[PDB]
Amino acid sequence: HWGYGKHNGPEHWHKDFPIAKGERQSPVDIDTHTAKYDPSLKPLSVSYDQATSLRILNNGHAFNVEFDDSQDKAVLKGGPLDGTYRLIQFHFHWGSLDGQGSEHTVDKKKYAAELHLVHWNTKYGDFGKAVQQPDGLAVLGIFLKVGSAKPGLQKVVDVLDSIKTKGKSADFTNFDPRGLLPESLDYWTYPGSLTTPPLLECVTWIVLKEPISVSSEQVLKFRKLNFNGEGEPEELMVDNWRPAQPLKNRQIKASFK
Ligand SMILES: CS(=O)(=O)N(Cc1ccc(S(N)(=O)=O)cc1)Cc1cccc(NCC(=O)O)c1
Numbered sequence: 693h694w695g696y697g698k699h700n701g702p703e704h705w706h707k708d709f710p711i712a713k714g715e716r717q718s719p720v721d722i723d724t725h726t727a728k729y730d731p732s733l734k735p736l737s738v739s740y741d742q743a744t745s746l747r748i749l750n751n752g753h754a755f756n757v758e759f760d761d762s763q764d765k766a767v768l769k770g771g772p773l774d775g776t777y778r779l780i781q782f783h784f785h786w787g788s789l790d791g792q793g794s795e796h797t798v799d800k801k802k803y804a805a806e807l808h809l810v811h812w813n814t815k816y817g818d819f820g821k822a823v824q825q826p827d828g829l830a831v832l833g834i835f836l837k838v839g840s841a842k843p844g845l846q847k848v849v850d851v852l853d854s855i856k857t858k859g860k861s862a863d864f865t866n867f868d869p870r871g872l873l874p875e876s877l878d879y880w881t882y883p884g885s886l887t888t889p890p891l892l893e894c895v896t897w898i899v900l901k902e903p904i905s906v907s908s909e910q911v912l913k914f915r916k917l918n919f920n921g922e923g924e925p926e927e928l929m930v931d932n933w934r935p936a937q938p939l940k941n942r943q944i945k946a947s948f949k
Pocket residue numbers: 751753808810823831885886887888889890
């Protein structure tokens with residue numbers, strides 16, 4: 693089954709998931725000179741004060757921090773979005789070295805990692821229905837560079853030893869995702885897809901311009917996770933990113949001048 697190895701990685705996905713070669717795949721390179729300011733984008737509203745984190749799971753591809761999405765507790769609204777999008781999980785993609793790891797790129801620059809906060813459009817009732825719709829999901833993407841530590845990340849780092857291998861989970865209550873945001877909410881936006889199988893073309897991407905800084909010790913702990921299950925050969929969870937896909941007939945819009 694699919695993964696990030698030489699034998700099962702992104703260049704193979706199209707054999708089981710032909711939409712991999714579709715018209716609105718993600719991630720993309722963001723050419724900053726070609727993206728145009730869109731003065732019509734409405735202000736972006738990140739409302740995470742009532743967020744209820746539940747659990748952290750190593751799914752063999754990344755780790756997901758899961759939220760209660762059975763009420764409007766943590767929502768994304770505004771920007772390019774019509775209606776209300778509920779936070780269901782966040783996860784990261786990262787590299788084996790600090791010079792790669794992000795999915796989106798900015799003028800071909802790769803960041804050390806990328807955070808994805810995944811939200812679904814409440815007009816579709818549940819996540820599984822939402823992913824069947826062209827406006828079903830909104831993913832807020834945030835770049836990570838290596839420098840100063842991110843204090844709000846450390847609770848995540850410290851639990852990773854307890855979910856080293858695929859299929860392990862741990863309680864992860866009372867985590868505040870506001871501690872993972874940068875100061876500015878300036879962004880780029882475009883219509884795209886999930887970046888893993890099933891690669892569904894259901895995402896409005898919102899990629900923040902300002903990266904967050906994390907320390908080398910924080911990212912080193914990400915790279916100690918395993919893709920494998922317990923009692924199986926160790927394969928470090930690194931380089932779990934899809935490279936940039938063709939932009940095709942899309943325009944990237946900027947929220948900022
Ligand atoms: C297997 S998973 O946990 O990785 N997952 C969730 C997901 C993927 C990618 C993003 S991202 N990088 O674009 O923000 C956001 C959410 C993939 C997924 C999404 C939608 C439906 C299914 N259902 C099961 C199936 O069909 O495998 C699975």
